[PDB]
Amino acid sequence: QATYTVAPGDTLYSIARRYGTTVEELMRLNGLESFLLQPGQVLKLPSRERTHVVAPGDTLFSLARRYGTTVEALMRLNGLSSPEIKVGQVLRLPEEGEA
Ligand SMILES: CC(=O)N[C@@H]1[C@@H](O)[C@H](O[C@@H]2O[C@H](CO)[C@@H](O[C@@H]3O[C@H](CO)[C@@H](O[C@@H]4O[C@H](CO)[C@@H](O[C@@H]5O[C@H](CO)[C@@H](O[C@@H]6O[C@H](CO)[C@@H](O)[C@H](O)[C@H]6NC(C)=O)[C@H](O)[C@H]5NC(C)=O)[C@H](O)[C@H]4NC(C)=O)[C@H](O)[C@H]3NC(C)=O)[C@H](O)[C@H]2NC(C)=O)[C@@H](CO)O[C@@H]1O
Numbered sequence: 215q216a217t218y219t220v221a222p223g224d225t226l227y228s229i230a231r232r233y234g235t236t237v238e239e240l241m242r243l244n245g246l247e248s249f250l251l252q253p254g255q256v257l258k259l260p261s262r263e264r265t266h267v268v269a270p271g272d273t274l275f276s277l278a279r280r281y282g283t284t285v286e287a288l289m290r291l292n293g294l295s296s297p298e299i300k301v302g303q304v305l306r307l308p309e310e311g312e313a
Protein backbone atom coordinates (compact mmCIF):
# COMPACT_ATOMS: atom_id res chain seq x y z
CA GLN A 215 0.00 0.00 0.00
CA ALA A 216 1.73 3.14 -1.25
CA THR A 217 1.02 6.44 0.50
CA TYR A 218 1.65 10.14 0.01
CA THR A 219 1.96 12.73 2.77
CA VAL A 220 0.21 16.04 2.03
CA ALA A 221 2.46 19.13 1.82
CA PRO A 222 1.40 22.82 1.96
CA GLY A 223 -0.23 23.88 -1.32
CA ASP A 224 -1.18 20.33 -2.36
CA THR A 225 -4.73 19.57 -3.50
CA LEU A 226 -6.50 16.32 -4.37
CA TYR A 227 -6.29 17.41 -8.02
CA SER A 228 -2.56 18.25 -8.02
CA ILE A 229 -1.78 14.97 -6.22
CA ALA A 230 -3.99 12.99 -8.63
CA ARG A 231 -2.27 14.50 -11.69
CA ARG A 232 1.20 13.83 -10.26
CA TYR A 233 0.46 10.16 -9.61
CA GLY A 234 -1.73 9.45 -12.64
CA THR A 235 -5.00 8.82 -10.83
CA THR A 236 -8.24 10.74 -10.27
CA VAL A 237 -9.77 12.99 -7.63
CA GLU A 238 -12.67 10.53 -7.22
CA GLU A 239 -10.36 7.55 -6.68
CA LEU A 240 -8.32 9.39 -4.03
CA MET A 241 -11.54 10.35 -2.24
CA ARG A 242 -13.00 6.83 -2.46
CA LEU A 243 -9.84 5.16 -1.19
CA ASN A 244 -9.49 7.57 1.73
CA GLY A 245 -13.16 8.06 2.61
CA LEU A 246 -13.01 11.80 1.90
CA GLU A 247 -16.09 14.03 1.59
CA SER A 248 -14.19 17.35 1.51
CA PHE A 249 -11.47 18.93 -0.64
CA LEU A 250 -9.96 20.33 2.59
CA LEU A 251 -6.57 18.75 3.35
CA GLN A 252 -3.94 19.43 6.05
CA PRO A 253 -0.15 19.19 5.78
CA GLY A 254 0.92 15.86 7.31
CA GLN A 255 -2.24 14.06 6.21
CA VAL A 256 -1.44 10.57 4.95
CA LEU A 257 -3.30 9.56 1.78
CA LYS A 258 -3.48 6.02 0.49
CA LEU A 259 -2.62 5.84 -3.22
CA PRO A 260 -4.20 3.46 -5.72
CA SER A 261 -2.03 1.05 -7.70
CA ARG A 262 -0.73 2.40 -11.00
CA GLU A 263 -3.12 1.63 -13.85
CA ARG A 264 -1.54 -0.78 -16.31
CA THR A 265 -3.42 -0.23 -19.59
CA HIS A 266 -5.72 2.27 -21.29
CA VAL A 267 -8.09 1.54 -24.16
CA VAL A 268 -7.95 4.60 -26.43
CA ALA A 269 -11.30 6.36 -26.87
CA PRO A 270 -12.52 9.01 -29.35
CA GLY A 271 -11.10 12.38 -28.34
CA ASP A 272 -8.00 10.98 -26.61
CA THR A 273 -4.61 12.38 -27.54
CA LEU A 274 -1.11 11.45 -26.37
CA PHE A 275 -0.87 14.84 -24.59
CA SER A 276 -4.16 14.28 -22.74
CA LEU A 277 -3.35 10.68 -21.78
CA ALA A 278 0.13 11.70 -20.59
CA ARG A 279 -1.54 14.21 -18.27
CA ARG A 280 -4.19 11.69 -17.16
CA TYR A 281 -1.63 9.04 -16.28
CA GLY A 282 1.05 11.29 -14.78
CA THR A 283 3.62 10.62 -17.47
CA THR A 284 4.94 11.96 -20.81
CA VAL A 285 4.26 11.58 -24.53
CA GLU A 286 7.80 10.26 -24.84
CA ALA A 287 7.26 7.47 -22.28
CA LEU A 288 3.94 6.43 -23.84
CA MET A 289 5.54 6.26 -27.28
CA ARG A 290 8.55 4.26 -26.05
CA LEU A 291 6.48 1.75 -24.06
CA ASN A 292 4.13 1.05 -26.97
CA GLY A 293 6.57 1.17 -29.88
CA LEU A 294 4.67 4.02 -31.53
CA SER A 295 6.08 5.27 -34.83
CA SER A 296 4.36 8.68 -34.58
CA PRO A 297 2.61 10.80 -31.92
CA GLU A 298 -0.89 9.91 -33.21
CA ILE A 299 -3.14 7.20 -31.68
CA LYS A 300 -6.08 4.99 -32.66
CA VAL A 301 -9.50 4.32 -31.11
CA GLY A 302 -9.43 0.80 -29.61
CA GLN A 303 -5.64 0.74 -29.27
CA VAL A 304 -4.51 -0.75 -25.96
CA LEU A 305 -1.73 1.42 -24.54
CA ARG A 306 0.55 -0.01 -21.86
CA LEU A 307 1.19 2.52 -19.09
CA PRO A 308 4.38 3.18 -17.08
CA GLU A 309 5.19 1.68 -13.68
CA GLU A 310 5.74 4.08 -10.76
CA GLY A 311 9.49 4.34 -11.22
CA GLU A 312 9.37 5.04 -14.94
CA ALA A 313 6.46 7.46 -15.47
C1 LIG B 1 0.95 23.38 -18.76
C2 LIG B 1 -0.50 23.65 -19.13
O1 LIG B 1 -0.90 24.75 -19.48
N1 LIG B 1 -1.32 22.56 -19.04
C3 LIG B 1 -2.74 22.62 -19.34
C4 LIG B 1 -3.48 21.81 -18.27
O2 LIG B 1 -3.08 22.32 -17.00
C5 LIG B 1 -4.99 21.90 -18.51
O3 LIG B 1 -5.64 21.08 -17.54
C6 LIG B 1 -6.45 21.91 -16.69
O4 LIG B 1 -5.63 22.55 -15.70
C7 LIG B 1 -6.36 23.42 -14.82
C8 LIG B 1 -5.33 24.11 -13.94
O5 LIG B 1 -4.55 23.17 -13.20
C9 LIG B 1 -7.39 22.61 -14.03
O6 LIG B 1 -8.17 23.51 -13.25
C10 LIG B 1 -8.09 23.26 -11.83
O7 LIG B 1 -8.97 22.25 -11.42
C11 LIG B 1 -8.78 21.88 -10.05
C12 LIG B 1 -9.75 20.75 -9.78
O8 LIG B 1 -11.08 21.15 -10.05
C13 LIG B 1 -8.99 23.08 -9.11
O9 LIG B 1 -8.54 22.60 -7.85
C14 LIG B 1 -9.10 23.22 -6.70
O10 LIG B 1 -8.30 24.35 -6.37
C15 LIG B 1 -8.78 25.02 -5.20
C16 LIG B 1 -8.04 26.33 -5.13
O11 LIG B 1 -8.21 27.06 -6.34
C17 LIG B 1 -8.54 24.11 -4.01
O12 LIG B 1 -8.93 24.79 -2.82
C18 LIG B 1 -7.84 24.85 -1.87
O13 LIG B 1 -7.66 23.59 -1.25
C19 LIG B 1 -6.54 23.56 -0.36
C20 LIG B 1 -6.33 22.13 0.07
O14 LIG B 1 -7.40 21.65 0.88
C21 LIG B 1 -6.79 24.51 0.81
O15 LIG B 1 -5.57 24.53 1.55
C22 LIG B 1 -5.79 24.48 2.97
O16 LIG B 1 -6.25 25.74 3.42
C23 LIG B 1 -6.51 25.78 4.84
C24 LIG B 1 -7.11 27.13 5.14
O17 LIG B 1 -8.37 27.29 4.50
C25 LIG B 1 -5.20 25.53 5.59
O18 LIG B 1 -5.49 25.48 6.98
C26 LIG B 1 -4.58 24.21 5.15
O19 LIG B 1 -3.29 24.07 5.74
C27 LIG B 1 -4.45 24.16 3.62
N2 LIG B 1 -3.96 22.85 3.19
C28 LIG B 1 -2.92 22.68 2.37
C29 LIG B 1 -2.59 21.26 2.03
O20 LIG B 1 -2.27 23.63 1.93
C30 LIG B 1 -7.09 25.91 0.30
O21 LIG B 1 -7.56 26.75 1.36
C31 LIG B 1 -8.16 25.91 -0.80
N3 LIG B 1 -8.25 27.24 -1.39
C32 LIG B 1 -9.25 28.09 -1.17
C33 LIG B 1 -9.15 29.42 -1.86
O22 LIG B 1 -10.21 27.81 -0.46
C34 LIG B 1 -9.34 22.83 -4.20
O23 LIG B 1 -9.03 21.90 -3.16
C35 LIG B 1 -9.03 22.18 -5.56
N4 LIG B 1 -9.93 21.07 -5.83
C36 LIG B 1 -9.54 19.79 -5.91
C37 LIG B 1 -10.61 18.79 -6.23
O24 LIG B 1 -8.37 19.46 -5.73
C38 LIG B 1 -8.18 24.29 -9.57
O25 LIG B 1 -8.54 25.46 -8.85
C39 LIG B 1 -8.40 24.53 -11.07
N5 LIG B 1 -7.60 25.64 -11.55
C40 LIG B 1 -8.04 26.51 -12.47
C41 LIG B 1 -7.06 27.56 -12.89
O26 LIG B 1 -9.17 26.45 -12.93
C42 LIG B 1 -8.31 21.88 -14.99
O27 LIG B 1 -9.22 21.05 -14.28
C43 LIG B 1 -7.51 21.04 -15.99
N6 LIG B 1 -8.41 20.42 -16.96
C44 LIG B 1 -8.23 19.18 -17.45
C45 LIG B 1 -9.26 18.71 -18.43
O28 LIG B 1 -7.27 18.48 -17.13
C46 LIG B 1 -5.28 21.38 -19.93
C47 LIG B 1 -6.76 21.53 -20.32
O29 LIG B 1 -7.10 22.91 -20.55
O30 LIG B 1 -4.55 22.14 -20.90
C48 LIG B 1 -3.13 22.09 -20.74
O31 LIG B 1 -2.62 20.79 -20.89
Ligand SMILES: CC(=O)N[C@@H]1[C@@H](O)[C@H](O[C@@H]2O[C@H](CO)[C@@H](O[C@@H]3O[C@H](CO)[C@@H](O[C@@H]4O[C@H](CO)[C@@H](O[C@@H]5O[C@H](CO)[C@@H](O[C@@H]6O[C@H](CO)[C@@H](O)[C@H](O)[C@H]6NC(C)=O)[C@H](O)[C@H]5NC(C)=O)[C@H](O)[C@H]4NC(C)=O)[C@H](O)[C@H]3NC(C)=O)[C@H](O)[C@H]2NC(C)=O)[C@@H](CO)O[C@H]1O
Pocket residue numbers: 247248249250
Ligand atom coordinates in the same frame (compact mmCIF):
# COMPACT_ATOMS: atom_id res chain seq x y z
C1 LIG C 1 -23.27 24.07 -20.85
C2 LIG C 1 -21.79 23.83 -20.94
O1 LIG C 1 -21.32 22.73 -21.18
N1 LIG C 1 -21.02 24.91 -20.75
C3 LIG C 1 -19.56 24.86 -20.80
C4 LIG C 1 -18.96 25.44 -19.52
O2 LIG C 1 -19.31 24.60 -18.43
C5 LIG C 1 -17.44 25.56 -19.62
O3 LIG C 1 -16.95 26.37 -18.56
C6 LIG C 1 -16.37 25.61 -17.48
O4 LIG C 1 -17.38 25.03 -16.65
C7 LIG C 1 -16.85 24.20 -15.60
C8 LIG C 1 -18.04 23.56 -14.90
O5 LIG C 1 -18.93 24.54 -14.37
C9 LIG C 1 -15.96 25.03 -14.67
O6 LIG C 1 -15.34 24.14 -13.74
C10 LIG C 1 -15.67 24.46 -12.38
O7 LIG C 1 -14.87 25.48 -11.87
C11 LIG C 1 -15.23 25.89 -10.55
C12 LIG C 1 -14.26 26.99 -10.17
O8 LIG C 1 -12.92 26.54 -10.17
C13 LIG C 1 -15.21 24.72 -9.56
O9 LIG C 1 -15.86 25.24 -8.40
C14 LIG C 1 -15.45 24.69 -7.15
O10 LIG C 1 -16.27 23.59 -6.90
C15 LIG C 1 -15.98 22.95 -5.66
C16 LIG C 1 -16.76 21.66 -5.66
O11 LIG C 1 -16.40 20.89 -6.80
C17 LIG C 1 -16.34 23.91 -4.52
O12 LIG C 1 -16.09 23.28 -3.27
C18 LIG C 1 -17.25 23.30 -2.43
O13 LIG C 1 -17.49 24.61 -1.91
C19 LIG C 1 -18.71 24.69 -1.17
C20 LIG C 1 -18.94 26.15 -0.84
O14 LIG C 1 -18.01 26.61 0.12
C21 LIG C 1 -18.60 23.81 0.08
O15 LIG C 1 -19.89 23.84 0.69
C22 LIG C 1 -19.81 24.11 2.10
O16 LIG C 1 -19.28 22.97 2.76
C23 LIG C 1 -19.19 23.13 4.18
C24 LIG C 1 -18.43 21.94 4.71
O17 LIG C 1 -17.05 22.04 4.38
C25 LIG C 1 -20.61 23.25 4.74
O18 LIG C 1 -20.53 23.43 6.15
C26 LIG C 1 -21.32 24.43 4.10
O19 LIG C 1 -22.69 24.43 4.49
C27 LIG C 1 -21.25 24.38 2.57
N2 LIG C 1 -21.74 25.62 2.00
C28 LIG C 1 -22.72 25.67 1.09
C29 LIG C 1 -23.09 27.05 0.61
O20 LIG C 1 -23.29 24.67 0.67
C30 LIG C 1 -18.26 22.37 -0.31
O21 LIG C 1 -17.95 21.60 0.85
C31 LIG C 1 -17.07 22.30 -1.27
N3 LIG C 1 -16.92 20.94 -1.77
C32 LIG C 1 -15.99 20.08 -1.35
C33 LIG C 1 -16.03 18.71 -1.97
O22 LIG C 1 -15.14 20.38 -0.51
C34 LIG C 1 -15.51 25.18 -4.67
O23 LIG C 1 -15.90 26.15 -3.70
C35 LIG C 1 -15.68 25.77 -6.08
N4 LIG C 1 -14.76 26.89 -6.28
C36 LIG C 1 -15.16 28.16 -6.41
C37 LIG C 1 -14.08 29.17 -6.65
O24 LIG C 1 -16.34 28.48 -6.34
C38 LIG C 1 -15.95 23.50 -10.11
O25 LIG C 1 -15.70 22.35 -9.30
C39 LIG C 1 -15.49 23.21 -11.53
N5 LIG C 1 -16.20 22.09 -12.12
C40 LIG C 1 -15.61 21.21 -12.94
C41 LIG C 1 -16.49 20.15 -13.51
O26 LIG C 1 -14.41 21.27 -13.20
C42 LIG C 1 -14.87 25.72 -15.48
O27 LIG C 1 -14.12 26.60 -14.65
C43 LIG C 1 -15.47 26.52 -16.63
N6 LIG C 1 -14.42 27.13 -17.44
C44 LIG C 1 -14.50 28.37 -17.94
C45 LIG C 1 -13.33 28.83 -18.75
O28 LIG C 1 -15.49 29.08 -17.76
C46 LIG C 1 -17.03 26.23 -20.93
C47 LIG C 1 -15.54 26.18 -21.17
O29 LIG C 1 -15.00 24.93 -20.77
O30 LIG C 1 -17.64 25.55 -22.05
C48 LIG C 1 -19.04 25.61 -22.02
O31 LIG C 1 -19.57 25.03 -23.17
